[PDB]
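Honest question from a wet-lab person: if I give you the sequences of every part of a complex, can you actually get the arrangement of the whole thing, not just the pieces? Trying it with mine:
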Amino acid sequence: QRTAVQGSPTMLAAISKQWVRGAKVEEDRIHPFRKYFEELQPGDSLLTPRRTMTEADIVNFA
Amino acid sequence: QRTAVQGSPTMLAAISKQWVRGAKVEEDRIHPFRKYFEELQPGDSLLTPRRTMTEADIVNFA
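Yes, you can. This is the full assembly:
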C-alpha cells in the first residue's frame, strides 16, 4: 500500500529510518568516517572547518 | 641541590612531570589540539596518518 506521510522533517526521518533534509542531527566529537557500519546511525553529522575561496584557487584548478 | 636521577624514561617522566623520549604515552581518540590547557597532560600523544614522498613533492617544494 502506498501512503503519503506529512509532518515535520524530524518525524519523517524517524518514520523512514533515513535522514531527510531539515531533520535533527547528532554530533559526536568522533569523526563519522571512523565509525563502523553497526555504530553508524542515520543523522550522525559533522560540521567541517571553513575554506576561503581565492582567485588563486580558480587559477590553480583551471 | 642538584641531583642526577637514573631510571627508565617512564619513571623519569613521572618524576619530572614532563614527557621524555622513550616514555609511555597515552592516546585518546580526541585530537590533542582540541583539548584546553587544563585537560592536557604531558604524554598525550597522536599518531598521524602517512604521506608517501614522491619526486613531484621535491619539484613542487623547490
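Two things worth pointing out. The helical segments of chain A are 9-16, 55-61. The interface with chain B takes residues 29-30 of chain A (CB under 8 Å).
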